[PDB]
Structures are given as structure tokens and as C-alpha cells.
């Protein structure tokens, strides 16, 4: 089965672009990454950085996850990210998203 690490890359990594290039980015990426297969994932974030840079977050600032778990880490640096959020017109299987470009610190959960 797909590993949790591999699932992370598929759902959130986009090292081939520096940032979302058009309003259609979310629509295209959510579809192509198979995130809309069973239902419309309501929210999703893509990171436009090298995988190594994102993997290094696991050795940066240790913080509590939103749910209280203690294996979260916050990037020391801000990263180029794209926020994908479902639109009022979204209706499975024609999932629709609004694309929002940003530069912020990311918080990931790490395992090993």
C-alpha cells in the first residue's frame, strides 16, 4: 500500500513550479494527484519547494500539532505554498477549488 511518506509527497509536494500560475492550479492539481477520487477533499495545501527542504523540517522547531500530538515541527523559514479550498460550486465529481498563493511557515507531523 502507499506509504504515509509517499502519500505526503503526492498530496502536498509540487517542486515543479515556484507558485500557482493561474486560477486553475487547484482544480488541475487536486484532480491529477487523485485527491478527488472518492470525494472532494475540502482543503489541501501544496508546497513549492524541494523535497529535501521539506524533509529537513523534521529536524527544525518541535511544536504541538493542532490536535495536541507532540511530533509536529515548524519550518524555520517561510515557504512558497498554494492553498486549495473548495468553492460553493464544488459538487462531486466536479470538485471545484479556489487557488490562494502564499509564503508562510509550514507545520508538519513527522514519523520514523
Amino acid at each position: 500500500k502507499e506509504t504515509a511518506a509517499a502519500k505526503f509527497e503526492r498530496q502536498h509536494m509540487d517542486s515543479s513550479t515556484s507558485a500557482a500560475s493561474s486560477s486553475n492550479y487547484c482544480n488541475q492539481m487536486m484532480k491529477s494527484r487523485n485527491l478527488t477520487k472518492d470525494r472532494c477533499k475540502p482543503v489541501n495545501t501544496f508546497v513549492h519547494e524541494s523535497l529535501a527542504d521539506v524533509q529537513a523540517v523534521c529536524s527544525q522547531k518541535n511544536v504541538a500539532c493542532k490536535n495536541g500530538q507532540t511530533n509536529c515541527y515548524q519550518s524555520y523559514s517561510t515557504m512558497s505554498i498554494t492553498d486549495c479550498r473548495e468553492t460553493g460550486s464544488s459538487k462531486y465529481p466536479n470538485c471545484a477549488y479556489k487557488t490562494t498563493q502564499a509564503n508562510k511557515h509550514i507545520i508538519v507531523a513527522c514519523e520514523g
Binding site: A4, A5, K7, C58, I107, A109, C110, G112
Partner: peptide
């Protein structure tokens, strides 16, 4: 190795 398995939030 210790790698990211979940995206928790952007701050």
C-alpha cells in the same frame, strides 16, 4: 529516517 507524514498547518 524521520520524514513528514501529515501537513498540519501554515503559519
Amino acid at each position: 529516517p524521520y520524514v513528514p507524514v501529515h501537513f498540519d498547518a501554515s503559519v
